[PDB]
């Protein structure tokens, strides 16, 4: 988790001249201290697009969108951590996540280098969609578990029979 410091002097007021010469009070009213949450979000967005990107000027690029969306997503994550039962934002969260993952699937198919970079930088891990979405239910889960166990046992026993065969034929051939 990052920390956009309480004194950080919100985004629109950073580039106006002679700001630091102003007295403590006005400097404090323009601080992230007296700010909204949306201000901290503007700041976080800027900082991230500068850290991660190449050309922070293009909003139109796939990667730029992926960054913005990632900021939004993290914010919803926070909101959902405070409000458990809010269904509206659980929808927003999951939905938005899917959008991001779609744009990712798109980057990975067009520009691979940048995709790789972004995945590393944002901590996003891209997984391939399985073929065959099916609901795993009690019967299938249990039966599959058994079948895997039966498999491991069978090949383990084949290995033991081969160790016995090797030992026997070797001790025979020697004398």
């Amino acid at each position: 988790q990052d920390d956009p410091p309480p004194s950080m002097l919100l985004l629109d007021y950073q580039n106006v001249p002679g700001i630091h010469k102003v007295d403590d009070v006005v400097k404090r009213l323009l601080s992230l201290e007296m700010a909204n949450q949306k201000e901290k979000l503007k700041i976080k967005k800027m900082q991230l697009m500068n850290k991660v990107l190449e050309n922070p000027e293009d909003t139109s690029s796939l990667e730029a969108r992926i960054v913005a969306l990632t900021v939004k997503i993290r914010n919803y994550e926070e909101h959902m951590q405070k409000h458990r039962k809010d269904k509206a934002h659980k929808r927003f969260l999951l939905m938005s996540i899917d959008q991001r993952k779609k744009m990712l699937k798109n980057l990975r198919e067009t520009n691979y280098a940048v995709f790789e970079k972004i995945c590393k930088e944002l901590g996003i891990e891209y997984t391939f969609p399985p073929p065959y979405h099916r609901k795993a239910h009690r019967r299938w889960v249990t039966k599959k578990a058994l079948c895997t166990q039966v498999f491991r046992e069978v090949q383990k026993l084949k290995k033991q029979k081969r160790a016995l065969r090797a030992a026997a034929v070797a001790a025979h051939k020697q004398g």
């Binding site: 009690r138 249990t142 039966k143 058994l146 039966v150 069978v154 026993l157």
Partner: protein
Amino acid sequence: KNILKIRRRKMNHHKYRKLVKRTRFLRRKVREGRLRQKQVKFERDLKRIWQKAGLKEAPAGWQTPKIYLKNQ
């Protein structure tokens, strides 16, 4: 007008619900027998699986849980 169809369905459903109320514990017994049958067939399936794989006993530490007979 179209209500005639709706009236038919209305009556059918009503009748049927009444029926389930009367026949309730018979139905109960039957569903329970069916769940037993289900659990058994599931067991047979698994047993057939490890046996056609050549093994004699079920693999080490296999209890074959009761999924259907699960307490309601």
